[PDB]
């Protein structure tokens, strides 16, 4: 009974593969290559935020584009002020192992999830835990806010979940992957979130229904970090085979590959620019290559850090890039 | 006219936080974080030093992502059970050759002629992986067990300080 079903799935899978290649009929490099490249990007460090003790594992900007929150492994969540390099809040954490931090788009709530597999929600109007979400069975890798009421989290027991804060229960659960879902990004319309996992697979989920809309499998190892193109039709993924790939949502396949044979170092964070022309990728050989995302050329290299860069964020007004690494320094680049 | 107020507000907002963290940096560096293998964190004191140990009994056995967080630790406690032995050798062989756990020691807990040779055999097999590749294995046996984790991390910190002066 199993073999006949597998053949039906294989025949159905074959229908996907021939259709995808037929639909393609060109590559993104061919059309784009005639346009003028941007040249070399000179980004200079402007701030260096030194308050942490252990390694800074995750940072998240705010939609205010001035305050950012960073969480290190010493059990401290610090809400920096990026303009005048002052600390607004320092929050002690019940668990010192914390792998993500999230800043709400209204700027009222800060959520950090760790290896305690509990997302915690901190109110900002002293500051204290408001609601703690404990439903996952593995660990909690990334989390993001939809609005002040509902938070999407990518756990590490293969399931993304959508949470309601006032109740404490999961309203919807997404169980399509076969590996630890490492990173999620949210669409600008805030209805679709891609998730990257350890299957070399990125999946597209619609947050209202709860089912895998699309699946993008073009990678060869675990997908570390994923980020949408800023219009909502594409996204870039970073993997452990030292490759960044740009996948399109509407064409359902991979447009481009950002890789060199000098790059044998796995990507830890991906982010886009404001327009989307520049693709920033943090690597674990302690620098952050800048890719001309339309033409797959290296515009520049950000080489200011001393240890492995973990998170990389670009502000909503597009003015700055703030990288956070394992030497406990957030450096803000312009 | 409110730029001056903002500077006055922030600078005495920042100063209370920076003086808080320097009274937390002393407690962070006086904390010898540990890892156990084979979610619960328990910190304890033996001879006036703090050992903050994180059991990972609540996680899955796909360990290739959440073990990289534990690179900071002092000593990884390894508990084996006795084909339950050979599959424990392959985990120890994997954390030994990892590119982020290359400098992390390992303490083994394996929990009368016939048994003695068997205990000797496990010690030999594990000692054959340490010689394959900055970090030294510490084997122990059955039958106090928390004093052996104090007395063996003290050897790790003595060897961590000899390297700094390029002695050993």
């Amino acid at each position, epitope marked *: 009974e199993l073999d006949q079903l597998r053949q039906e799935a294989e025949q159905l899978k074959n229908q996907i593969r021939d259709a995808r290649k037929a639909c393609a009929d060109a590559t993104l490099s061919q059309i784009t290559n005639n346009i003028d490249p941007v040249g070399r990007i000179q980004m200079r460090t402007r701030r260096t935020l030194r308050g942490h003790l252990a390694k800074i594992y995750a940072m998240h900007w705010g939609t205010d584009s001035r305050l950012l929150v960073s969480a290190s492994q010493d059990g401290k969540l610090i809400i920096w002020d990026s303009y005048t390099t002052n600390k607004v809040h320092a929050i002690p954490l019940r668990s010192s192992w914390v792998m993500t931090c999230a800043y709400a788009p209204s700027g009222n709530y800060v959520a950090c999830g760790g290896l305690d597999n509990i997302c915690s929600i901190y109110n900002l109007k002293n500051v204290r835990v408001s609601r703690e979400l404990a439903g996952h069975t593995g660990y909690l890798s990334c989390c993001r806010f939809l609005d002040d009421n509902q938070i999407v989290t990518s756990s590490g027991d293969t399931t993304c979940a959508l949470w309601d804060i006032e109740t404490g229960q999961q309203t919807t659960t997404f169980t399509g992957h076969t590996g630890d879902v490492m990173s999620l990004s949210l669409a600008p319309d805030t209805r679709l979130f891609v998730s990257g996992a350890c299957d070399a697979s990125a999946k597209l989920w619609d947050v209202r229904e709860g089912m895998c809309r699309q699946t993008f499998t073009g990678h060869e190892s675990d997908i570390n970090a994923i980020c949408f193109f800023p219009n909502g039709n594409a996204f870039a993924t970073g993997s452990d*085979d030292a490759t960044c790939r740009l996948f399109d949502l509407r064409a359902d396949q991979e447009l481009m590959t950002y890789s060199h044979d000098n790059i*044998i170092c796995g990507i830890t964070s991906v982010s886009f620019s404001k327009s989307g022309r520049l693709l920033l990728a943090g690597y674990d050989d302690f620098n952050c290559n800048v890719w001309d995302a339309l033409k797959a050329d290296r515009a520049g290299v950000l080489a200011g850090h001393d240890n492995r860069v973990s998170c990389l964020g670009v502000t909503d007004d597009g003015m700055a890039v703030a990288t956070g690494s394992w030497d406990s320094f957030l450096k803000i680049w312009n | 006219e409110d730029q001056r107020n903002e500077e006055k507000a922030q600078r005495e907002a920042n100063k209370k936080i920076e003086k808080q963290l320097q009274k937390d940096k002393q407690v962070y560096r006086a904390t010898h974080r540990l890892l156990l293998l084979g979610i619960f964190e328990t910190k304890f004191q033996v001879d006036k030093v703090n050992f903050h140990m994180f059991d990972v009994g609540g996680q899955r056995d796909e360990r290739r992502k959440w073990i990289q967080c534990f690179n900071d630790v002092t000593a990884i406690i390894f508990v084996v059970a006795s084909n339950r032995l050979q599959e424990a050798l392959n985990l120890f062989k*994997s954390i030994w050759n990892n590119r982020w756990l290359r400098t992390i020691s390992v303490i083994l807990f394996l929990n009368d002629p016939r048994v003695t040779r068997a205990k000797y055999f496990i010690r030999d097999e594990f000692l054959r992986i340490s010689t394959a590749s900055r970090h030294y294995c510490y084997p122990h046996f059955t039958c106090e067990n928390i004093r052996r984790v104090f007395n063996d991390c003290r050897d790790i910190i003595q060897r961590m300080h000899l390297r700094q002066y390029e002695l050993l």
Partner: nanobody, 128 residues
Framework: QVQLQESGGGLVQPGGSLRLSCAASGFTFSNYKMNWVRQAPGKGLEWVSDISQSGASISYTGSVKGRFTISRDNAKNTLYLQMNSLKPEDTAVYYC?????????????????????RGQGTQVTVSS
């Protein structure tokens, strides 16, 4: 995109032989480190053997050492496992596993709980 297909198997005499041929597609085979893993009926997953990235460093489990010998060939993009003088006690489902990272030496692929990069399973069976 990693798909691993296997050949071989079938009912064999005690003390016979079998050749399990893992076929690899989707990844660049020269950079990764292959592994074979049993799963006996009633047991969990066990480990069998591996090769390094070049085709040099081979290890085995103590129960199969001297009886089985494995080999990859990177241009043919395949992996092999030749068993010899098989026991009636080692009928199992054999998978072709791959360690998840390029150009490393550490592997975490004995797990049953949803490992992604492993084959379909080949039921080697020994009657008597």
């Amino acid at each position: 995109q990693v798909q691993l297909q296997e050949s071989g198997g079938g009912l064999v005499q005690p003390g016979g032989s079998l050749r399990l041929s893992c076929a690899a597609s989707g990844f660049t085979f020269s950079n990764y480190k292959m592994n074979w893993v049993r799963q006996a009926p009633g047991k969990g997953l066990e480990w069998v053997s591996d090769i390094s990235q070049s085709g040099a460093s081979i290890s085995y489990t103590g129960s199969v050492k001297g009886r089985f010998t494995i080999s990859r060939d990177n241009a043919k993009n395949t992996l092999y496992l030749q068993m010899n003088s098989l026991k009636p006690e080692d009928t199992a489902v054999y998978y072709c596993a791959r360690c998840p990272a390029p150009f490393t030496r550490d592997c975490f692929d004995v797990t049953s709980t949803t490992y992604a990069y492993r084959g379909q399973g080949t039921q080697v069976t020994v009657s008597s």
